[PDB]
Amino acid sequence: NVPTYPSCRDSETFSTFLLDLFKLTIGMGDLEMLSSTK
């Protein structure tokens, strides 16, 4: 700090990142940015 993926890492971080990973490449070229990073 809270169990939200667009802020923190959860159990589904293994899933939802790699879903959002190639989506951002092909057609989701708009922002889609994870603010809370180190």
25 or 36: CB nearest a copy of itself: 25
What does the binding site for a copy of itself look like in residue numbers (CB under 8 A)? 23, 26-30
Q: How far apart are CB 26 and a copy of itself at their closest, in Å?
A: 5
30 in a known ligand binding site = yes
- b vs e for 4-18, b when ≥16 Cβ sit within 10 Å of the residue's Cβ? eeeeeeeeeeeeeee
Residues 6+ apart with CB under 8 A from 32: 20, 23, 24
Q: How far apart are CB 30 and a copy of itself at their closest, in Å?
A: 5
Annotated binding-site ranges for Ca(2+): 30
